[PDB]
């Protein structure tokens with residue numbers, strides 16, 4: 001049975017997610033419009049840049065994150081941002097569609113669309129397969145937000161100083177998640193192990209995105225299509 | 239009577255302008271959409287960033303520009319780009335409207351719209367007054383493109399090394415323009431002097447834009463709305 | 477260094 | 487320094 005403290009953590013993570021995932025997708029009309037080889041890059045760079053702002057907002061409300069040093073906060077967001085975006089995008093992904101549905105018809109994204117932004121199928125094929133594997137787990141929203149927080153608060157990320165402080169934060173969240181699944185998720189005996197495997201999947205996806213981003217960022221006619229916030233977060237400065 | 243060499247200069251400048259001013263304005267649908275205090279900044283930053291690319295294309299076809307060193311080319315574009323954009327925008331400005339009409343209704347710009355991108359009336363009131371004063375001159379297209387080239391090739395700009403080389407280029411263009419007006423422009427005895435005064439007007443406008451841009455660029459929630467190419471060209475690096 | 481990130485983190 | 491400008495100037 002979960003304690004009040006463990007329950008307060010769940011409450012605060014759910015509220016944080018609800019404050020920064022917009023189910024109406026109303027901001028997408030603000031992006032440079034989609035065009036359907038690099039024709040989707042303006043739209044999808046704007047989309048990812050928007051999502052980064054949402055991940056930053058979410059992170060700032062994870063209990064303990066804001067007390068870390070500014071350097072550790074930056075280090076955790078720079079290495080985990082693409083992973084959190086992939087994770088949080090599962091709530092618009094559909095097994096029936098194999099697509100991300102974000103409101104209107106202009107903002108439904110195939111595999112055909114997302115291969116038109118400078119990235120190839122060696123990133124996009126594992127990403128789609130990760131989405132369906134994750135969707136099939138049928139996570140409660142409590143499990144979904146806990147996984148995002150655990151992913152964000154991984155101490156084995158380049159640039160973090162206070163390893164022990166953030167590992168302590170992560171272990172607390174892991175404890176919450178294991179107890180949640182045991183008490184509240186019928187048939188979830190194997191679920192925690194599968195969720196941890198998805199964290200490994202994300203590391204692999206992160207590596208492939210980072211390798212391919214280096215190609216874009218070295219071609220100035222492509223990098224000039226990105227946003228300042230994307231250049232900062234996926235850039236190599238320390 | 240104009241020589242063949244002076245005539246070849248006019249031909250090449252007109253062709254250069256026709257290659258990089260798109261009378262159909264078809265690319266404007268690619269920008270982040272207008273929103274009608276900072277609500278026009280995404281759209282107008284995209285608009286200005288697009289215009290910078292066009293000015294670079296124009297500059298690369300001015301006889302003599304491409305033979306300057308890469309540093310001098312960068313120095314001339316960084317100090318003159320905003321002036322060339324203000325100048326070239328006169329071909330969509332209307333005395334009847336006091337607006338810039340760029341194709342469809344979403345891309346007609348009032349004084350009300352262009353005050354919604356972080357800049358105030360101490361830039362926008364002189365800019366509009368400059369537009370009507372320029373429009374009233376009824377420049378031939380030959381005079382218009384020559385003025386843009388002369389403005390671009392001003393040696394009294396910060397960062398230029400080869401002053402004497404680019405002053406020589408500018409004097410040639412000035413000679414062309416004075417002879418053009420005398421032979422081909424009826425009643426143009428006072429025109430060259432007025433065009434030179436507009437170059438002074440642009441310096442003042444440049445100074446005010448640069449001062450106000452510093453405000454935007456120091457507020458990261460605003461500068462993050464700009465494009466990488468805008469940050470490069472209006473930035474302070476040497 | 478990381479001007480926008482710092483601002484967004486408050 | 488001026489990475490995009492250099493590229494656009496060829």
Ligand SMILES: C[C@H](CC[C@H](O)CCO)[C@H]1CC[C@H]2[C@@H]3CC[C@@H]4C[C@H](CC(C)(C)O)CC[C@]4(C)[C@H]3CC[C@]12C
Pocket residue numbers: 044045047048051085086088089090091092093100102109114117118119124209213216226230234
């Ligand atoms: C459309 C979805 C988001 C749906 C959400 O519900 C909306 C709220 O976040 C995103 C998620 C992962 C994204 C891909 C990640 C890898 C890569 C990043 C790259 C960004 C760049 C160019 C900076 O590397 C752009 C192209 C992709 C393939 C992304 C496409 C959009 C996806 C699927």
Ligand SMILES: C[C@H](CC[C@H](O)CCO)[C@H]1CC[C@H]2[C@@H]3CC[C@@H]4C[C@H](CC(C)(C)O)CC[C@]4(C)[C@H]3CC[C@]12C
Pocket residue numbers: 282283285286289323324326327328329330331338340347352355356357362447451454464468472
């Ligand atoms: C709408 C017109 C362009 C019409 C052309 O025919 C289209 C092809 O170029 C532009 C010209 C000057 C622009 C202003 C310059 C000063 C300032 C720059 C600033 C750019 C920033 C934010 C980087 O400082 C955005 C806001 C303005 C006022 C510009 C608005 C659009 C105008 C009138």
